[model samples]
Target chain A: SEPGRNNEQPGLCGLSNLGNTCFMNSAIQCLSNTPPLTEYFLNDKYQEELNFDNPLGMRGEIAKSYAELIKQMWSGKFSYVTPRAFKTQVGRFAPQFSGYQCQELLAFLLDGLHEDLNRIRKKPYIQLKDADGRPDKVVAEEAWENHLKRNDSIIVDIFHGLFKSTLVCPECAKISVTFDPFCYLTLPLPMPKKPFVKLKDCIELFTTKEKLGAEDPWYCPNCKEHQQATKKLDLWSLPPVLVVHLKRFKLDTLVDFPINDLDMSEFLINPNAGPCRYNLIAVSNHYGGGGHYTAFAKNKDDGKWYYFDDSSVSTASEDQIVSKAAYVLFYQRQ
Target chain B: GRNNEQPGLCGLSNLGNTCFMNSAIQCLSNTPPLTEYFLNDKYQEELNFDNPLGMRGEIAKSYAELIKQMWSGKFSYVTPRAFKTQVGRFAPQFSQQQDCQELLAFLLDGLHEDLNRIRKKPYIQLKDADGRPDKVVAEEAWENHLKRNDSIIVDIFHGLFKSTLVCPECAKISVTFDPFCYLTLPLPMPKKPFVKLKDCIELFTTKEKLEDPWYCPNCKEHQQATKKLDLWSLPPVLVVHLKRFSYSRYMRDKLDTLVDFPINDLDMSEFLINPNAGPCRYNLIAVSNHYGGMGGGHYTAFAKNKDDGKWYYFDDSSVSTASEDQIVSKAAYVLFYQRQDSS
Candidate 1:
């Protein structure tokens, strides 16, 4: 039977909020709508990489619980599923989430899952080499290889990207370049002296050149003195699933973001390195006053958007996705 | 010692909107050591007429003539026509109304070259600090600077500035002690209506962020870093030019904020990088004031006569006795401070 034709389709199910755990529920709904991650767990691909021996991991408990929750949502047998067992497993390891008191939840959950299901059984201490006049392709590949030596997992394969940081000494004019891995981008709001601004402006601001403050001075070897230097950051590579968290606690300005084709080619250091176009897959929103959490996700089966507020699920338009309340955005590569 | 009451009390006639030149001249003319050096004809023995960088000693000869005429007490107000014409031959821009600070810098630099004691300037290789003590490095830098330049201007006006740079990645630091003729301090756009001169001095010596990033050797990456400037040494005659005019892509504006400066006991001990560098105190001697806006403005000087020890205002062709209260104002662009204990 076609899942779209029927009312009981996989991933159309809502999540029951555990008291003040709407933030957790909202984040889960967004991740549940992620096609590749949902498929990986559903197809039992995470079982082989269950790293119980890794001390950094949750001893395979959080991964197993997460996988069970994903199966229940994709089973399409219930309209709403209670995540008590998964929350219990999370609270057992991370006591912060044990209480219903609390950007941090999603990242913590992603980190827990990545560690529990990490492929590298015994991570080695790898020494990283400086770019040192090497070609961009060679340096980037080496940096990625070094990162994978310690962290190799499905999360690393899907979510991880590279960042290029450039620093210049003002006095002697020496340049230093490095490539590091990043899972998600926490973009700073432009906070412009205006009513409205584009999401591209935030990205531009995130990648723009910024001066290091007086408190954080860089030591220059050529000058043999501490001098004020300029620093710039650029996206060296793009991930398959791009998670962008806007610093929304700082503003209430309406950010006009592209829902269909968020072209990130201009911001990338190497635009031709991979696919640079992404479509909005999901969004986690936080409404005002005591802060109730909700999510808007596009269903993979019918390509229709659905809004999830705890146990309440409803069809939503594309225009309703981009709003001032949008905190965390999830986009999938085209 | 000298007849300071009648000597420098004479006014300079405006040679076609030459108030900027006259204002700068009066400030230097009242400087004790520089004035006494010209009055005693000590510059005649040291005048480097063969120096290619100098104006063939023409500017110095014209300036000496003007100083002698003004100090002779022959005229109540004398025209600096020959001095103005001589400076105009080298820099045609000085013929019209210009920045008083720029004119002052040009004159000081020109005078230094003309009165240079060194017959041949040696090509000295610059050495880095290389983790040496600041005192040692600073002394070496000064010695190197003096190897090529030994003049009354160098002796009285020039001082050392300690500049520092740091690399964020490897935590490597570099420092250089370079010579400075005078300090050009940026006026703070204060929240209050008025600010102290110390506030401007603090702003000048504070650590500032660089507009461009620095490259690191350890990380082999460009990183953001901070820079700081500190006063390593101080000149006997401290010429402070307050940055009043600002030019942007859109407009040019002037800051007319009143900067309250001490006429006596202007302690610079705290602003210095080293505490053991001796008593750093100054007494205000002169001030070049600019009134009106960017394109067109008038310049005037407030000088304290050394003999009578009284403040006098010099506005081009006009000279009037001024009160001590009138010295500090919104029009105060450049200040001339003398070391309190200097001989």
Candidate 2:
């Protein structure tokens, strides 16, 4: 454990473009920058369990590919490494990106990766046999653990959170609340007049309520008819690694985002759950309309930020990380 | 005129917001046809110096002299005060972030007027001698009353464009040929990775329906008309100004769209009226770069060095080697492409 061990060499690895796959490369870089995921993927914890060659093993293919890529990245033999297997496997899961010609949306890639890992976690149970010679049905406690709660998949555990939706029937005066899982908090940016928008303001805007229309109404349980209702959302829980996507395309404008040391205690509904704070580790910036995709990720091992421009990796300053072009931000909990 | 005299360093002095002027001067000074014309003392032979008002014609003299010095490799980093002072005489209201394209056109117009041969005209002729009725009138100002219908600069750089408006109902076509100093093309939202310059020209000349119908003489009523713009005559040195700055919802921004232009042999035959009539191929030689945003920005020029044939960047008070990749960039605000040997 050296103080600046990451500084000894280029801490982050560069990924080559197998066509317009920079989006996936950048997303992977940001994910790799997350400390917990870095530790989890690099270590041999999953080395004993990952089985991609088994005929019944439909899972663990992506996780195995990702793990191997992470190990190759740290070796420093190649300046730029191509994630051929991981990319092809991900493309198989997300058929929209089967070819490398067109650019795929970031959300689709994240969703595809998350779904692949969830299948990996469920594979063992599906393959398990019963002692009493009963059918291979999910047990009672296992059902609750599997289907009735937030995803325990490796992807979600590292970068997912929950949101509680509360809706009140105006006519019946009844309350109904539901919780939904989310991988990233997509926040709307502030208006142009404001020089800088605090992260707190965006969370408030996300949790704000909207009244249901007179014609389009919610079904009231007591009234047994359609009635206007007020619906709102609040953050129920936060993940270890918080991924925030600034909703820049809704307005197609610039938003001045905070670079480091963002606090969310005031905006969180679960305020009593220890300290709600985050420090920025990575940022994915977009230049113009369908132009270029470049990334800046802070190497915790080196304590310096590195910019990944397609296959080129160079040192970047803190000022460059905090920019108007920041589309996606990766922050680790302090 | 020596070959190995260590080519004088050419850098423009920044006077207020005159970087636009500096950029234009550096770009125009490298143009081969224009540069050779100024270096060979052709304007001196064409200029009319006799004037009753005793005007020095300072702008033309300073401009022509600077061109000769630049061509001769005499001084390093020449000051543009005399040139600016002469320009400010005609355009007094110019102050901040002025359009460099318009200034270039006006500068050429002024130089053409000064170097014109037939600028003198008979205005307010003096009365004949009453004693014997003398009929020989004095030439009060030779520069005046000699404005010709044409200019050498115009003959080389100016071109005609025919805008046709067709009435859809009556199929009546009305064509009007207008003179243009430059072609200002639109860079539409790029639908592909690399947008060709011809695609942009096509977008500029694309047939657009008139929102408000034109009153056609043949139809005898307001009818829906289709309007199209095309190149009627191509100039020797084609100056293309890309409309980069767009204002929407009262906010101004630059397009920064990457246009992949050919370094040589850019065939404009498809866009021209007669594809095989004349040489429509052009070679890119100079580029005017504008960096930063709408409220504030900087201007620089990238021109092909005559000695080495490599591109050199000319910022205000600094000059350096520029890469070919740097010349064809998103910052390319204006493009100067010269006509090739043949189509």
Question: Cα-based RMSD of the predictions, in order?
Answer: 30.0, 22.3
Candidate 2 lDDT, A1-334, residue by residue in tens: 3211233243367887787763778777887677677677677666655544433333667777777877777655656777889888777656675443422456665554455445344334433211132221223224324432424456677676766666788877787765556778888776654556756777787888858677756787678988788887787667788888877763444455555447777666654567677768899877663446788997755446789876678887776677667888888875
TM-score for candidate 2: 0.43
Model 1: DockQ score: 0.00
Q: Which candidate is the best by TM-score?
A: 1
TM per candidate comes to 0.48, 0.43
Model 1: runs farther than 4 Å from truth?
A1-334, B1-5, B96-100, B167-171, B190-192, B211-225, B248-251
**Model 2: CA > 4 A from native:** A1-334, B1-9, B48-58, B98-100, B117-148, B167-171, B189-194, B209-225, B248-251
User: What is candidate 1's CAPRI-style docking category based on DockQ?
Assistant: incorrect
Two-chain DockQ for model 2: 0.01
Alpha-carbon shift of residue A311 in model 2 (angstroms) = 53
**Which of the numbered candidates is closest to the native, going by highest lDDT?**
1
State each model's TM-score restricted to chain B: 0.91, 0.78
lDDT of 2 by residue, B199-221 (tens): 89999899878847468877888
